[PDB]
């Protein structure tokens, strides 16, 4: 009953956003709650932010 089929393959790119569930290898879950600015994060004595 079908004449012709056209299949289109989109390639979406999902970066990150508040809401996405990230986890670890030890059962530590958690959804991202905020994408903090680079200069608002805690930093050690060498200036490297976490």
């Amino acid at each position: 009953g079908v004449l012709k089929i056209v299949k289109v393959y989109l390639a979406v790119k999902r970066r990150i956003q508040p809401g996405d569930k990230m986890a670890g290898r030890h059962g530590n879950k958690g959804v991202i709650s905020k994408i903090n600015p680079i200069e608002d994060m805690p930093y050690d004595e060498n200036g490297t932010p976490v």
């Binding site: 390639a11 970066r15 600015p37 680079i38 200069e39 060498n46 200036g47 490297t48």
Partner: protein
């Protein structure tokens, strides 16, 4: 009264990172100025990142080009990491044409004498066979902050814009035993740029931004 700090020294250790010094400072002003300048530098610094690329035989970034082992997406990542300083213009279109076996680095870009590549060893891709040639047009444009392609021809590939020359800023407040007076502070600012911003210019711009923001109530 309050002694005025001034840029007394610029110890440029390497091409990327430098170490500036401010002296003298009163009690507490060392940390205040250090943190204010660190936040300004990490936030708002003009940069010359790549925005658009156009490889000739490539339609979308999820494809491959014969003779190049990097995927087009990896090529776009390598171009996104490209550090370049443009001086007389805001936007500019660099041209890359390279053929033959070997690493296509950033030194193969057409010079465009008002545009300087600061890291010629930056490998962009690899050409595997001799009969292969790549030709791309790279739109390097001036901007501020981080502008992803989601916010802003079917052969034009858009890359995420990351116009921020600085990569790491740290400051240290020490005791400047000078001028026959004790209990004075000296602020040493260690900044890690990608080479496209002079540290004295960075500090000057950071102080200018603070001075402009303070005009709201003075």
């Amino acid at each position: 009264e309050f002694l005025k700090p001034r840029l007394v020294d610029i110890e440029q250790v390497s091409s990327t990172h430098a170490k500036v010094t401010l002296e003298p400072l009163e009690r507490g002003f060392g940390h205040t100025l250090g943190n204010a300048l660190r936040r300004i530098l990490l936030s708002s610094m003009p940069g010359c990142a790549v925005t658009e690329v156009e490889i000739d035989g490539v339609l979308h970034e999820y494809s491959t080009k014969e003779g190049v082992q990097e995927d087009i997406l990896e090529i776009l990542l390598n171009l996104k990491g490209l550090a370049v300083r443009v001086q007389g213009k805001d936007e500019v279109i660099l041209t890359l044409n390279k053929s033959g076996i070997g690493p296509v680095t950033a030194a193969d870009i057409t010079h465009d004498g008002d545009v300087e590549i600061v890291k010629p060893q930056h490998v962009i891709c690899h050409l595997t066979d001799e009969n292969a040639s790549i030709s791309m047009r790279i739109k390097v444009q001036r901007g501020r902050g981080y502008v992803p392609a989601s916010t802003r021809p079917i052969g034009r590939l858009l890359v995420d814009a990351c116009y921020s020359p600085v990569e790491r800023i740290a400051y240290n407040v020490e005791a400047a035993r000078v001028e026959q007076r004790t209990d004075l502070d000296k602020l040493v600012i260690e900044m890690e740029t990608n080479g496209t911003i002079d540290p004295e210019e960075a500090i000057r711009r950071a102080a200018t931004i603070l001075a402009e923001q303070l005009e709201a109530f003075v």
